């Protein structure tokens, strides 16, 4: 699947979306990586669901940093590495 890769690349984005400093560029290119991997909704599930669990394991995740991954890489994904995105509605 992809939840495994997505996790390995969305777990390092934690220091940014939560640490504060970042992103390192590879973060937005990582979520964009999902963009090239998942093609249909059933494909995001692994991805989105991943960023969900991962993003949902930090002391105080920051939505601002986790809300600019797409606004920066211009990917336009529906979900993000956060404890609140929505995979049931991945368009």
Swiss-Prot record:
Q: Which GO terms describe its molecular function?
A: lipid binding
Q: Where is the lipid attached (Cis-14-hydroxy-10,13-dioxo-7-heptadecenoic acid aspartate ester)?
A: 7
One biological-process term from Gene Ontology? lipid transport
Disulphides: 3-50, 13-27, 28-73, 48-87
Tissues expressing this chain: Aleurone layer of developing and germinating seeds.
Q: Which residues form a coiled coil?
A: none
Q: How is it used?
A: During brewing process, structural and chemical modifications of the protein occur. Both unfolding of the structure and glycation should increased the amphiphilicity of the protein, leading to foam-promoting forms that concentrate in beer foams.
Going by the UniProt record, its keywords in alphabetical order are:
Disulfide bond, Lipid-binding, Lipoprotein, Signal, Transport
Signal keyword on record: yes
Q: What does this protein do?
A: Plant non-specific lipid-transfer proteins transfer phospholipids as well as galactolipids across membranes. May play a role in wax or cutin deposition in the cell walls of expanding epidermal cells and certain secretory tissues.
Family of the protein in this entry? Belongs to the plant LTP family.
Recorded protein name is Non-specific lipid-transfer protein 1
Q: Which organism is it from?
A: Hordeum vulgare (Barley)
Q: Which residues of the full protein are shown?
A: 27 to 117 of 117
């Amino acid at each position: 699947l992809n939840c495994g890769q997505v996790d390995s690349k969305m777990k390092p984005c934690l220091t940014y979306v939560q640490g504060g400093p970042g992103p390192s560029g590879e973060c937005c290119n990582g979520v964009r990586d999902l963009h090239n991997q998942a093609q249909s909704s059933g494909d995001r599930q692994t991805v989105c669901n991943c960023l969900k669990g991962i993003a949902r394991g930090i002391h105080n995740l920051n939505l601002n940093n986790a809300a600019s991954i797409p606004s920066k890489c211009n990917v336009n994904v529906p979900y993000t590495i956060s404890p609140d995105i929505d995979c049931s509605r991945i368009y």
